[PDB]
Amino acid sequence: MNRIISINGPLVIAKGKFSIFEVVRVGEEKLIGEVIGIENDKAYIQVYEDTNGLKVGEPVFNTGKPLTIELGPGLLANIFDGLGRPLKDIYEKTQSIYIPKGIDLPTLDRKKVWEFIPKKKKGDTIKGGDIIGTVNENGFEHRIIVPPNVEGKIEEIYEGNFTIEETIAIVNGKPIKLYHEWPIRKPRPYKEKLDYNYPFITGTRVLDIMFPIAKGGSAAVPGPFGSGKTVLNQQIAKWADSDIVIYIGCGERGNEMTEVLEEFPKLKDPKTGKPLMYRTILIANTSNMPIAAREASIYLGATIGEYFRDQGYSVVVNADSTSRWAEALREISSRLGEIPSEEGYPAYLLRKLAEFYERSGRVRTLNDLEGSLTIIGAVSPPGGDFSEPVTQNTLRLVGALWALDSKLAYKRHYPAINYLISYTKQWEFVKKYFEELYEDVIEIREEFFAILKRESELMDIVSIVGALSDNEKIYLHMGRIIREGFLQQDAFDENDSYSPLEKTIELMRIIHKYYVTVKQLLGIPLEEIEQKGIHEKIIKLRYKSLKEFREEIKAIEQEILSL
C-alpha cells in the first residue's frame, strides 16, 4: 500500500499512512528508516542505509515502533554499528569483509548462556528501575534493572543459567527478561540530579590537574586535523577511572575502531587488573557508512550510557566526532529543503546538540543508587577555526574546553592542549578532593598557570633578542620544564601513557621544589644553575618505570643541594 514517490540521498518520501518517528522498512530489501516528518498523505523518511538503486515503484512497510536498543548482557567487550548491529556477527554470517546493505541481526547474542543470581524473593514488591538480580559479564557485575514502567509483586523469580530471551521472573502476569528495549531518542528517567562530588580522573596529567571536570560532567575537545583528538579520547577510554567506557566512532576512520579492537584486549585496568576490553563498548559508524546512522550512533551510545548509569555505575562516553553528526543533520535538512542557518547548518543545531549533552550528569537512580554519565565530545572545526557553529554551540553546553592547538601539534607537543585558551568551569567542585588528599597542589597549580602565562607574555619580547634579565629568563626555564616534563605525555610510551595521581602529584612537587630553590639562588647567575643539569633530569622523569621514578626523585632532591 505505502509507496516511495521520491528518493533524494538519505531522504525517502513515501505516500501512505505513517506515524512520526515510526521505524519503517524501505523497499523490497527492507532498509531501516525512520519517519521524521509528515505532510498530509506524505511521509519524510531518513534511511539508515544506502539508497542507490532504490525505485519509485517500491513499497514501504510499517513497524509501529520507534528506534530502540536492546539493553542487557552482551554489550560489553563488543563492537556494534550505529543501529546496534554486532559487527562480529555480520562478519561471521556473511563470511565477507564488507558490510551488506539491509542485513538485520539482533543486538544481543541469543545463544550465549548467562548465570543470573536473583536479589529479590518471590512475593517481594518491585518498582521501576529496581535491581532484580545480577549477571557476571566476564568480571563485571551487570545489574539487571527492571524497565522503568514495570511495577508490582514478584509472582515468580528464577535462578541459574539462562539465555537472553528466557523469562527470569514474572511480575503482575508479565514476563521479565535479562534485557529490555528502549527508544534511543528518549532520555532514561531518574529521581534527581545530584551535585558534583568527585573529580573525573583520566590518567592524563593536563586533564587531571590543569582543566579537570567532575564525574558526571562534560567537556569539548575541538582541534584541527592531526591535532590529537582521537588519541586523547582513546587515552581517556584507556585509563579513565570509570566502571564503563563507551567509545562512539561517529563518522571517523575504520582503522581507528580496529586499533581499539587490537590493543584494548592486551591492556590491563590499573584498578582491577582486568583487561580494558571487558569494561568497554564500541559503537562504530565510520565516515563511509550511511550518514544518517551517525545520528543514531550518538543517541544509541548515550542511551547505553544512561542504562549503566541506572545500575548505579559511573560511565564515560567519548564521541569522536560530533561534527560528523552535525554534517548528517545539515545533509538531512538540505534534502528536506529547509532554509539553512549559520554555515549551512539547520537553525535547530544547538537544540539537537543539547539533546546529547543534557543527558550527562550525576544522578540519584530510580533504585536510589548514585550513578554518573560523563560525556566527552570531540569537535572537528573546518580549517581549525573555533568560531564555527558546532564548536561555539557546544561551548555553551559543556563544563570544560579542552582546546587542541596547531602550534603545539606542529612541534610534536602532545597532548596539544592550549593552556591559555582551555578552561574548566568545574574546578570549584573538585578542588575539595585535591586539597584533602594533597594540600599544596592548589598553590602549585596556580603557580604553573602563572609561569606558563608569564612565559607567554615574554615570547613576544623575545622577538627582539632572547637580552632578557635573569628574573625573566627563569620563566622560560621553568616554563620549558612544565611543558616538556609535565604537560607533555607520550600516549605510546609504556611508562608515560598512564599517569596515576601519585606520579602526577610527585612531578608537581619536585618541579615546585626546584622552583623555590632556583628563585632563592637568583643573586649566582642562571647560566651556572642550568649547568648542573637538574632540569634535564626532571624532564626525563615521566619516561621512567615507577620504581625508577621514585628513585630518581630521591636522587634529584639531594642534588638540589643549594648549600
Partner 1 sequence: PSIKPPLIAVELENPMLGEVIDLEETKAIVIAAYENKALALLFDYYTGEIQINRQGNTYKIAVSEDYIGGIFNGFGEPIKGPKPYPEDYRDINGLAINPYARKVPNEILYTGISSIDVAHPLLKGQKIAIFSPPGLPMERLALQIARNVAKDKTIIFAAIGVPSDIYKMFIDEFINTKAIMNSAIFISKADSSPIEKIYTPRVALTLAEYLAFEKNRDVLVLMLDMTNYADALREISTLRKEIPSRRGYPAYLYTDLASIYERSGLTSKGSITLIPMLTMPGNDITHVVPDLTGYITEGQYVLSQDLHSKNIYPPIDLLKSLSRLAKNGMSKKHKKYADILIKSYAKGLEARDIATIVGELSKEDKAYLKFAELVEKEFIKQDYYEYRSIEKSFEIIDSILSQSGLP
Ligand X SMILES: Nc1ncnc2c1ncn2[C@@H]1O[C@H](COP(=O)(O)OP(=O)(O)O)[C@@H](O)[C@H]1O
Helices 349-357 and 293-309, axial angle in degrees (round to 10) = 30
The contact pattern for ligand X, residues 407-426, with x = CB under 6 A and - = no contact, is: -------xx-----------
C-beta atoms surrounding 408 within 10 Å: 21
Position 226 contacts ligand X (CB under 6 A): yes
Q: At its nearest, how many Å lie between Mg ion and the CB of residue 244?
A: 9
**DSSP H or E run through 143:** strand 140-145
Position 251 contacts ligand X (CB under 6 A): no
Q: At its nearest, how many Å lie between partner 1 and the CB of residue 504?
A: 21
Q: Report the distance separating Cα 299 and Cα 321, nearest Å.
A: 13
The contact pattern for ligand X, residues 365-404, with x = CB under 6 A and - = no contact, is: ----------------------------------------
C-beta atoms surrounding 127 within 10 Å: 12
Position 104 contacts ligand X (CB under 6 A): no
CB contact at 8 A, 160 and 116: yes
Among residues 107, 12, 94, 18, the alpha carbon closest in space to that of 53 is found at 12
- Of positions 372, 393, 424, 426, contacts Mg ion by CB under 5 A: 372
* Minimum CB distance to partner 1 smaller for 158 or for 449: 449
Near ligand X in 41-70, by CB under 6 A: none
Q: Report the distance separating Cα 14 and Cα 538, nearest Å.
A: 67
What is the SS3 string spanning 322-335? HHHHHHHHHHHHHH
Near Mg ion in 312-351, by CB under 5 A: 314
Near Mg ion in 296-315, by CB under 5 A: 314
Is 225 marked within a binding site?
yes
Strand partners, 140: 137
* Minimum CB distance to partner 1 smaller for 127 or for 396: 396
Size of the site for Mg ion (CB under 5 A): 5
Is 333 marked within a binding site?
no
CB contact at 8 A, 30 and 24: no
- The strand pair at 79-80 and 280-285 is best described as parallel
Q: At its nearest, how many Å lie between partner 1 and the CB of residue 385?
A: 8
Position 19 contacts partner 1 (CB under 8 A): yes
Q: At its nearest, how many Å lie between partner 1 and the CB of residue 273?
A: 26
Position 230 contacts Mg ion (CB under 5 A): yes
Near ligand X in 461-500, by CB under 6 A: 489-492
Q: At its nearest, how many Å lie between Mg ion and the CB of residue 413?
A: 17
- The strand pair at 169-171 and 152-157 is best described as antiparallel
- Of positions 215, 330, 359, 503, contacts Mg ion by CB under 5 A: 215
- Looking at 322-411, which runs of residues are DSSP E strands? 361-364, 370-379, 400-401
DSSP 220-256: EEE--TTSSHHHHHHHHHHH-S-SEEEEEEES--HHH
Position 225 contacts ligand X (CB under 6 A): yes
Q: At its nearest, how many Å lie between ligand X and the CB of residue 229?
A: 4
Of 58-66, 221-229, 445-453, 532-540, the segment contacting ligand X by CB under 6 A is 221-229
- 534 Cβ partners below 8 Å, 6+ apart? 514, 556, 559, 560
CB contact at 8 A, 316 and 200: yes
Near partner 1 in 450-489, by CB under 8 A: 450, 453, 457, 460-467
| 489, interface contact from Mg ion, partner 1, ligand X, none, CB < 5-8 Å by kind | ligand X
Nearest 5°: the CA angle 550, 553, 555 is 115
The contact pattern for partner 1, residues 293-332, with x = CB under 8 A and - = no contact, is: -------------------------------x--x--xx-
Position 230 contacts ligand X (CB under 6 A): yes
Among residues 450, 435, 438, the alpha carbon closest in space to that of 503 is found at 438
- Of positions 28, 56, 540, 555, contacts partner 1 by CB under 8 A: 56
Nearest 5°: the CA angle 114, 117, 118 is 130
Position 235 contacts Mg ion (CB under 5 A): no
Biggest CA pair distance of the chain: 93
Size of the site for partner 1 (CB under 8 A): 117
Q: Which three cell numbers stand for residue 68?
A: 530502540
CB contact at 8 A, 321 and 253: no
Near partner 1 in 506-525, by CB under 8 A: none
The contact pattern for ligand X, residues 141-160, with x = CB under 6 A and - = no contact, is: --------------------
Near partner 1 in 360-389, by CB under 8 A: 361, 380, 382-387
* Minimum CB distance to partner 1 smaller for 131 or for 403: 403
* Minimum CB distance to partner 1 smaller for 464 or for 563: 464
Known binding residues for ATP are 223-230
Which residues contribute to the site for Mg ion (CB under 5 A)?
A: 215, 230, 314, 372, 374
Known binding residues are 223-230
